[PDB]
Amino acid sequence: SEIGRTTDPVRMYMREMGTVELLTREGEIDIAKRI
Amino acid sequence: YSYTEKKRIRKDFGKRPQVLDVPYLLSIQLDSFQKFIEQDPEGQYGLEAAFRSVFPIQSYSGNSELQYVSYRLGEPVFDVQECQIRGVTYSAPLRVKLRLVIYEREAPEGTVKDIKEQEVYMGEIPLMTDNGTFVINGTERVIVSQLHRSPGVFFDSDKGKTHSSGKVLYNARIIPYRGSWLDFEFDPKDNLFVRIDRRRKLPATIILRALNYTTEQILDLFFEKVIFEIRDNKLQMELVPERLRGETASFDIEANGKVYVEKGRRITARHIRQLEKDDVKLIEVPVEYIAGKVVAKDYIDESTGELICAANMELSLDLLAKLSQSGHKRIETLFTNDLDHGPYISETLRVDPTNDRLSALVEIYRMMRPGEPPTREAAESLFENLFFSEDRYDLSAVGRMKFNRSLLREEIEGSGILSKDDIIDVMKKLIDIRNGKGEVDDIDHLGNRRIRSVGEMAENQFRVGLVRVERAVKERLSLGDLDTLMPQDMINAKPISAAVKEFFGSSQLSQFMDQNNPLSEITHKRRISALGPGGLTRERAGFEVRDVHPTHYGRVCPIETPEGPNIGLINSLSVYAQTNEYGFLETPYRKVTDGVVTDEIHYLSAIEEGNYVIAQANSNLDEEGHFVEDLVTCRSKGESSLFSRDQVDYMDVSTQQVVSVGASLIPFLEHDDANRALMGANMQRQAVPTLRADKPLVGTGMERAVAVDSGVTAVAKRGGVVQYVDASRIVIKVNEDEMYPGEAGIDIYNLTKYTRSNQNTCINQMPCVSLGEPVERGDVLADGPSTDLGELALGQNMRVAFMPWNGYNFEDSILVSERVVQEDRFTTIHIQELACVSRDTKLGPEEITADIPNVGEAALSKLDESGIVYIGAEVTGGDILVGKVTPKGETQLTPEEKLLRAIFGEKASDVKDSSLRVPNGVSGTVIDVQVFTRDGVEKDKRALEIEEMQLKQAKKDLSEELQILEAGLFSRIRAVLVAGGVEAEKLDKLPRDRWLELGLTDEEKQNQLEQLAEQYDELKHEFEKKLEAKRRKITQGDDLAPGVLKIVKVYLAVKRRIQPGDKMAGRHGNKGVISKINPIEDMPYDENGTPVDIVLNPLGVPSRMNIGQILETHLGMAAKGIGDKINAMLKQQQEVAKLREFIQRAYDLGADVRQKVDLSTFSDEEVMRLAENLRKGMPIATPVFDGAKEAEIKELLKLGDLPTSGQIRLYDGRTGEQFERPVTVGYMYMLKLNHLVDDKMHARSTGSYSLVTQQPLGGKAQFGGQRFGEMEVWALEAYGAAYTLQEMLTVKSDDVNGRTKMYKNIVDGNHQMEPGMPESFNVLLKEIRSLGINIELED
RNA sequence: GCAG
């Protein structure tokens, strides 16, 4: 995709971090129940 | 005249009558800052515009807002001199009235739930003094005007300097005042590309697709269509005949008839006119005329819905057939005729990989923020934050003016952000320039460069500070504490004040002021600078920006500029140059209406100046206005040529219009080479003020202007009579004409005595007027440094002979007599401030004391019991001025020192002598001591003595101002009381304080008595509240730096006399170092016995062709020849009739001069006073480029009974026999420059060594050590000096164990070295091994 | 800012 076009570590962190969709109010409850 | 100009009238040789007096020379600085801080209800200038640019500040949700109502500057805490003493900025508090509006929660408007209006303090802004300076941290700084490229669109080229084909490549560049640059350019394949902030380039149609244009709309914008319409058969083609200018048709043209041009024949304008005479609108061409033609529309099918040919698709006969089958009898097609309408846009529509707006926004995102995945909602926000939001892009008002002016629009005002129209018009003009119907902009034209000055840079920095605070107040307004906070609880003054603090103290353009003489000040203020923030860099600045342009004429001095690495980047404003309201320089001209030169002046900018044709100033004209010639030299386009007298549109307003103020002071500037004129202009500003200022015998006439328009002098604000005059003050009793009702009518001028300039010279004012003398508004009352009776005087009138003398003036040396040293001619006072800082250390505090260890009581004889030197002490180098000891520990005696002290019992001391001493070679007088004590430290006897002296002085000064002012009030009351109901026998005995309440017959005079009594009561109320303020400012503790307990500043005054090594100069670039101070009897002498004061080398004239210095000599001998004539008439005590006749014969000399001195209107007292001021030589005025001709110099030489060749015969003083040839003897004006040999001589055997690498320290302030650079090492390798070199490397410099062995070896008488390894090589080895690289030394 |  966009891989290889930047070397900035903050751009790389944000780009890799944004691939994880947020949790809803009942998503956190499900994950805590799993823990 | 005057009364201060008929004391000594300078004989003017200028012939052109002047129509425009020289303006206020500091208008740039004062006007700029006045625009910055003044209240502006229109809201365009300074703080008001900056506040309206940021406020109102809505919340993120809009529930509340912070709006701005008004601002106001407080009064400064300290006046200018207290700021220079206490070392603090001279500033005024900015108090701004804000209002926090809280809307409601549920409301149709958000109606006001509350308003909280209060006045929040944000920052202190520095204040320009009344001379155009700023006192920032106690030093006077000048903020230099910047010369930067105007915002706007600039079309340029590189003139075939790429791809070796010699192809000129064009580029437009949109430069805003703030925001992202936007360039369009051509590549060698004729494809329009675009760059944003100079990062990698995209095809230019991507920025056209980010704006919502399709390919069809793009081809609509940049092109026009040749319409092919299918009538009955055979491909009829609509014809516009001018599209057929200059081609070779592949086919003959037959329209309903006559064949116009056969196949392969070229078409000329006769054929176009013939086709339009026939009114040809239709052709039928061969079918392969569409082999290469590009369709200009989206042509789809109606039968099968297939998209046959979209836009920008090159056609062919098969495509033509499949396109005609769908009922498409209309074929729109691009008209691209070669060499006048290129395919550039339709060619780039093929090079960009983009098809739609969203893909273009994605491509711009990928270029701008690479490596980050572009989403739609961020790519379409980045673009409309690039050039289309006022928060991020301001093309400004100058930007929009230059922008529309470049695209030939008629509106000069608009929005500050770009538009579709602006970008498209820029592309159209770039394409026009490619098609040969435009011209690129000259980027060094002074219509493209703009003066950005103090009040604009200061506003820019203030507005940067304002956005810094408003982001935080937006962050704070969206919190939920919103009901109980006031606006000053969310404003942080520290960012706002830090922006202006770093601007005024740390900017490149905020400079330590040159304060040598008045000329240095007033030319540092009129200084233009290409450098600075937002401008060039002196290394990367090319050859072409450093050159003098044809639009510098009258706007920027060509000659006054530096000489080193920033030449042509630091410029000086010309004498009459102004700035536009936009910042572009403009200069005045006289209008030539019909061949009559009017005296109506118009300030023309650099672009307007190129439209008209403009006569010279040396262009002759008679008293009717008409040019006495008919073929006049003029300038019309920057080109200069000859024109008729009825083509002439304007005329230069003065002959010195073209040069700066510092170059306006070189007499006979028109005879110097421009290099030597540059050097003279630059060495007039380094000339230190001598003891007794001496007017130039040969000036130009700008000396009065430079001396007054710089604030070094004390000019009378209202005219009057000198009531009291004294070496430290002048009390002027105003005329009754000029004083206001209800006023004392007295002006006190407190002169400045023996203060330090920034260059450690002394700036001292002497009263010029004498007691009881009538002065007028504008007369000079006090001569500052380097002024003589109001005329700028930078050097002394020395008697030079031009002759080689026995080797002593070889290669620019100067041989001075001894009478120049006896007479204290070039002796200058220099004042040094030396501070001793008692700090708090970790082993105890340092204390200022007279009980200094290891120092005899002979050295402490000048210190008083407080440990500080006595004021008035004659000190020399090595003397203790401020005795101070430091507590010390970690004693750790050696075994031998332990035995030595167990033998004699003289124990070690627990304090270390840290005294302040006079630097070596300095010898002077303590003239001032200032003691600053941190509040909480007890004052010693001397700080209390100094405080009590200051309180005595404050009370004495304010009681004396009240005495003078109340004496003036009582004299005015006495004058009004005797105007009716005269009490002349009664008034002088009654107690004066009852005159305040003596009720008289009130016709209207008791009203004036009411106002005069109110004035006296107010003066009595005001003196007390000024004295209490002064007491509480004197006795208050000082805000010292953290750590310091007290600071003792001692001021030495050093009289430096002239001596071999001191660098003297003249006004013509003839600098020189004094080689010998020759006895009087050794100097060459003329037949009367008068020896020469200075012997110069004649070989310094003909190669460096500053011939002016010869003429100023010949004229300076004429002038003195008049003086020593008048002098004779004052020693024989001739009648004033004979004196009046001779001085009139001297002032009437010259061929058609502009001045007439008719001194039959002078009284005998005035003639004798003038003749007394002319007895040291009659001062001449030689205006620049208008000066005294050679014949006038010879005529004045003949009047003084001197030889008209200017060359007398001299005798050798040593052998008494005549030099075999006549010798040019006259009076030059020699300047003593600030490069004194006392300050340059340095020597060091051993000293302090640098910390990391163990080499000697750098400069003569730290006891130095000279750098044996790389080139000197080569010079020793070029001889075979291996041992000298090896000791320069090891034992003189870096060898830590070898330098001490070498020292003790020299002291032992054994000149032998034991060299080791330089320590810096070990530093290098350890700094490479810390890189993960194993560097070793192989045994 | 400057000096050569």
Ligand code: 118
């Ligand atoms: C960084 C960038 C440019 C230069 Sb130069 C220069 C050098 C000394 C004094 C003034 C200028 C330079 C560059 C462009 C246009 C004009 C001058 C420079 C470059 C090569 C060789 C010698 C000097 C030096 C450092």
Ligand SMILES: [Mg+2]
């Ligand atoms: Mg520098």
